[PDB]
Amino acid sequence: ITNARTNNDETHATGPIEDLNSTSHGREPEIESFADRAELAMMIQGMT
Amino acid sequence: RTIWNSSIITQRISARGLMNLEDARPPEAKISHQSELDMGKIDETSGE
């Protein structure tokens, strides 16, 4: 067993998928989303 | 708006609004309570 106080990346789970149920691969990217920012701060305005 | 005071937060509001939106009393303006404009005698022994 070894440790790592690391939270800025993964760099610890690597490998090739071998089946749509494979559970030990690397990491693939995700949908490129956007800002969608709406805070909750006592009379914020529209920005529609 | 998101936050909402759950109890009363206006004990230090003597007067709200000196306007005249229709050249009369604004229908939600607040003059002070008659309790805070009392001038009674003092017992001549200990102020009070």
DSSP designation for B43: B
Residue located via tokens 């690597």: A14
Q: Chain B residues contacting A, CB < 8 Å?
A: 1-3
Experimental technique used to determine this entry: cryo-EM
Please enumerate in sequence order all residues whose Cβ is within 8 A of that of A16, keeping only pairs 6 or more positions apart, or say none: A25, A26
Chain A residues with CB under 8 Å of B3 CB are 40, 42
Q: Is any Cβ of chain B less than 8 angstroms from the Cβ of A1?
A: no
The whole-angstrom separation of Cα B29 and Cα B48 is 33
**Resolution of the structure, angstroms:** 3.9
DSSP designation for A8: S
The whole-angstrom separation of Cα A33 and Cα A39 is 18
**List of E strands, chain B:** none
Chain B residues with CB under 8 Å of A41 CB are 2
